[PDB]
Design a protein around this ligand. Structure first.
Ligand SMILES: CCC(C)(C)NC(=O)c1cc(C)n[nH]1
Ligand SMILES: [Zn+2]
Ligand SMILES: [Zn+2]
Ligand SMILES: [Zn+2]
Length: 459
C-alpha cells in the first residue's frame, strides 16, 4: 500500500458541470482512459497518474496548482492557470498571455515547469480542484509511458521532445515540448463542502480571487498546504537534501552558541528561560546561569500569544533574567529576549509559498511558519554582527592576509593585532552568519545588549 490503486473510486460530482452526464461510479482507471491516455497494463514505475495525499506530502516541493477555465471544449479557447502566477490562452484553431495554438503553448509549459522545479524536485505534482476542463486539457501537453532517465544525466525524465524523440529531466529540457509522466492530485477528493473560494477563504486572506485561472491555481495549492501542513503536521517525514541544508543547520547552531554565550557574559543574567523545542539542549553548556526549559512545538498556524505561553500560573517570573526564543514564534516578544525568527518573505529553494502569508520551510522536515511580522519585535532591536572568543591565541596545524575588524572581540584584537587563529575563526564565523541570514533567519536582542561589555571579560 504505497501507490494509489487505479481501481480506487473517484467522485465525479465536481466534474459534471464541464462534463454533463459523467457516471457517478468512476475509477481512476476509467478517468485516465476518458482523459485520452492509455496505461497498457504496464508495470514500469508509473502505476497511476494520480497519487495519494501521503505521496503528495512527500513531494510537496513538486506541487504546482493548475486550473483551466473556459474563455468562451474543442471549439473554445481555454485559459490555463498555474500557481506560478502564469495564465496562458490556448486556442484550438498575474501574467496574462494572448491566445496561441497548443503546439506552442506546450513549449512554454515545459520551460515554465522546468525553470520553477529544476532546483526543487525530480517531478511535478499538479494540484487540482478538478471541474473537468483541466483533466481534458492534459492530452494536449502531457505524454505518459514507462519511467525513464534523462538523455544527458542520471535523473528521472520529466519532459519529452517530439523533435528529437528523446527524454530529459528539468535541467536538460530546453526546446522540449511535452511534460512526461507528471503526477496529480484532486483536492476535491478529500471531502469538502462548497466551492474552492469558500474553503480557501476560511484560512487565508492573502490570496484574492481576481476571477482568473492562476488565482484559482494559487488558492488550490494554498488550500492543499493548509490541509497537509497547517491543520495536520508530520515532523517524521524526511525530505531530501537539495541545497545548503547542512551548512545552514550547522551555521544556526554556531550562531546560537555565540549569541547566547555573549549575552550571558555581557549582562550576567542569573536565569535563562529557554522557550521552544521540547528536545532543546543547553546551547552554552559551560555557562553558570540557571537554565530553565519550557516546551512549545513550532507553531504552524498563528504565532503563539505571549499571554498563553507565560500566564495561567515554572520559574513564573519570566521578567527575571533573559528569555531565549530560538525559532519559537510569538506575537510580541518581551523586552528581556534573545530571538531567532524565520522571515517567511525570504526567496530560496528551501522556502516554499505558504498559507495566509506564512511559508513552508523545507529543510530535512517541513515546517509551515506564520507570516513574518515586524511588530513582534517592538521591544527589541536587531542584533548586530560580532564575533567573540575567549579561546587561546594559538594557530595549530589556507593562505593569509591580516584581519582588521572592530567586531572581532578577542584578547589579540584588544591587544592591538588579531592573531592568525582568531582571524581564521572570525572569517569562518562570518561565513556561517551570512549563510544563516541569507537563508531567511533574523536575529533580535534586548535593547541594552552592547558588545562593548565583552572587552572586560579578558583580564
Ligand atoms: C539544533 C540547534 C538549533 C540552533 C536550535 N537549531 C535550529 O534552530 C535550526 C534551524 C535550522 C534551519 N537548522 N537548525
Ligand atoms: Zn538531465
Ligand atoms: Zn491562500
Ligand atoms: Zn587571538
Amino acid at each position: 500500500p504505497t501507490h494509489l490503486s487505479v481501481d480506487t473510486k473517484f467522485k465525479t460530482e465536481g466534474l459534471c458541470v464541464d462534463i454533463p452526464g459523467i457516471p457517478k461510479d468512476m475509477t481512476y482507471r476509467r478517468l485516465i482512459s476518458m482523459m485520452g491516455f492509455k496505461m497498457n497494463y504496464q508495470v514500469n514505475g508509473y502505476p497511476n497518474m494520480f497519487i495519494t495525499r501521503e505521496e503528495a506530502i512527500r513531494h510537496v516541493r513538486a506541487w504546482i496548482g493548475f486550473d483551466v477555465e473556459g474563455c468562451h471544449g474543442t471549439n473554445l479557447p481555454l485559459q490555463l492557470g498555474f500557481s506560478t502566477g502564469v495564465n496562458l490562452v490556448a486556442v484550438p484553431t498575474p501574467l496574462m498571455y494572448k491566445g496561441l495554438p497548443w503546439n506552442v503553448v506546450r513549449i512554454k509549459i515545459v520551460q515554465m515547469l522546468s525553470d520553477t522545479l529544476k532546483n526543487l524536485s525530480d517531478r511535478v505534482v499538479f494540484v487540482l480542484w478538478a471541474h473537468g476542463f483541466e483533466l481534458t486539457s492534459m492530452k494536449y501537453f502531457v505524454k505518459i509511458g514507462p519511467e525513464r532517465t534523462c538523455c544527458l544525466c542520471d535523473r528521472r525524465a520529466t519532459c519529452f521532445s517530439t523533435a528529437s524523440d528523446t527524454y530529459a529531466c528539468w535541467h536538460h529540457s530546453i526546446g522540449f515540448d511535452y511534460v512526461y509522466n507528471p503526477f496529480m492530485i484532486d483536492v476535491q477528493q478529500w471531502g469538502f463542502t462548497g466551492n474552492l473560494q469558500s474553503n480557501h477563504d476560511l484560512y487565508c486572506q492573502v490570496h484574492g480571487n481576481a476571477h482568473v485561472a492562476s488565482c484559482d491555481a494559487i488558492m488550490t495549492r494554498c488550500l492543499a498546504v493548509h490541509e497537509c501542513f497547517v491543520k495536520r503536521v508530520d515532523w517524521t517525514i524526511e525530505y531530501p537534501i537539495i541545497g545548503d541544508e547542512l551548512k545552514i543547520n550547522a551555521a544556526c547552531r554556531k550562531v546560537q552558541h555565540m549569541v547566547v554565550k555573549a549575552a550571558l557574559l555581557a549582562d550576567k543574567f542569573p536565569v535563562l528561560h529557554d522557550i521552544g523545542n521540547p528536545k532543546a539542549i543547553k546551547c552554552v553548556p559551560q555557562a553558570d546561569v540557571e537554565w530553565k526549559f519550557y516546551d512549545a512545538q513550532p507553531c504552524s498556524d498563528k504565532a503563539y500569544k505571549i499571554e498563553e505561553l507565560f500566564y495561567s500560573y515554572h520559574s513564573d517570573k519570566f521578567t527575571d533574567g533573559v528569555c531565549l526564543f530560538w525559532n519559537c514564534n510569538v506575537d510580541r516578544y518581551p523586552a528581556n529576549s534573545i530571538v531567532c525568527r524565520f522571515d517567511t518573505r525570504v526567496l530560496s529553494n528551501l522556502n516554499l509559498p505558504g498559507c495566509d502569508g506564512g511559508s513552508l520551510y523545507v529543510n530535512k522536515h517541513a515546517f509551515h511558519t506564520p507570516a513574518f511580522d515586524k511588530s513582534a519585535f517592538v521591544n527589541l532591536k536587531q542584533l548586530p554582527f560580532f564575533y567573540y572568543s575567549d579561546s587561546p591565541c594559538e594557530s595549530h596545524g589556507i593562505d593569509y592576509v591580516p584581519l582588521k575588524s572592530a567586531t572581532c572581540i578577542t584578547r589579540c584584537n584588544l591587544g592591538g593585532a588579531v592573531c592568525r587563529h582568531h582571524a581564521n575563526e572570525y572569517r569562518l564565523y562570518l561565513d556561517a552568519y551570512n549563510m544563516m541570514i541569507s537563508a531567511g533567519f533574523s536575529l533580535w536582542v534586548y535593547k541594552q545588549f552592547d558588545t562593548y561589555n565583552l572587552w572586560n571579560t579578558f583580564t
